[PDB]
C-alpha cells in the first residue's frame, strides 16, 4: 500500500463521498480536497496529504495505475478519478 | 490490493467520513454501511459488499491487517477500525 494507487483510489473514493454528499464545494478544490484528506484520517506513510502529495501521486499516477485500480473499479471511478483532475490537474 | 487490509482501510475510512458528515446514522448500521460502500463505489473485485464481503473481511482480518495499515493509520482510525465492530461486529 505504498503507492500511488492506494492514496488514488483512496482519494476518488472519498472526495466522491463527498461529491455524494453535495459536497462537491470541497471535491472541487485542492485546498477543501487536500483537508478532507487531512480531516477524516486519509495518509499514504503516515501523513495526510498537505498539497504535494496529490500532486506527485498524479505526476507520477500512470494510466496503468488506473487500470489496475479500474480492476476494481470498473466504471464506478470515470467521475472521480477525472473529477479529481478538473478540479485539482497537475 | 486483494487483501482485507484494503477494503478494510477504505470501509473505515469512507465510514469515518460518514461519521464526520453526522452520518453515524450510516455507520451505525450494517445494512446502511454495505449500502454506503455499495454507493460511493466501493469494491474489492470489481463488485461491492453485499453483507458477506465486510463479514469474511473482518472474519479474516488479522491484527496483522490492523498493523499494516496502522503504520500509516497511526492513531486516526482507533475510533472507525473499531467502529465499525461496534456497530458491525462479527
Redesign the interface.
Request: cysteine-free; charged content about 30%.
Given at each position: 500500500?505504498n503507492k500511488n494507487?492506494?492514496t488514488v483510489?483512496?482519494i476518488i473514493?472519498?472526495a466522491?463521498?463527498?461529491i455524494?454528499?453535495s459536497?462537491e464545494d470541497i471535491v472541487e478544490n485542492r485546498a477543501n480536497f487536500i483537508a478532507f484528506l487531512n480531516?477524516?484520517?486519509?495518509?499514504?506513510?503516515?501523513r495526510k496529504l498537505n498539497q504535494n502529495s496529490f500532486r506527485k501521486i498524479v505526476s507520477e499516477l500512470t494510466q496503468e495505475d488506473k487500470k489496475?485500480?479500474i480492476?476494481?473499479?470498473?466504471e464506478?471511478?470515470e467521475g472521480?478519478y477525472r473529477y479529481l483532475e478538473m478540479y485539482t490537474n497537475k
Amino acid at each position: 500500500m505504498n503507492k500511488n494507487i492506494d492514496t488514488v483510489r483512496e482519494i476518488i473514493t472519498v472526495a466522491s463521498i463527498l461529491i455524494k454528499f453535495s459536497r462537491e464545494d470541497i471535491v472541487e478544490n485542492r485546498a477543501n480536497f487536500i483537508a478532507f484528506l487531512n480531516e477524516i484520517g486519509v495518509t499514504h506513510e503516515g501523513r495526510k496529504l498537505n498539497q504535494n502529495s496529490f500532486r506527485k501521486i498524479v505526476s507520477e499516477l500512470t494510466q496503468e495505475d488506473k487500470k489496475t485500480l479500474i480492476d476494481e473499479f470498473n466504471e464506478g471511478f470515470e467521475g472521480v478519478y477525472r473529477y479529481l483532475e478538473m478540479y485539482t490537474n497537475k
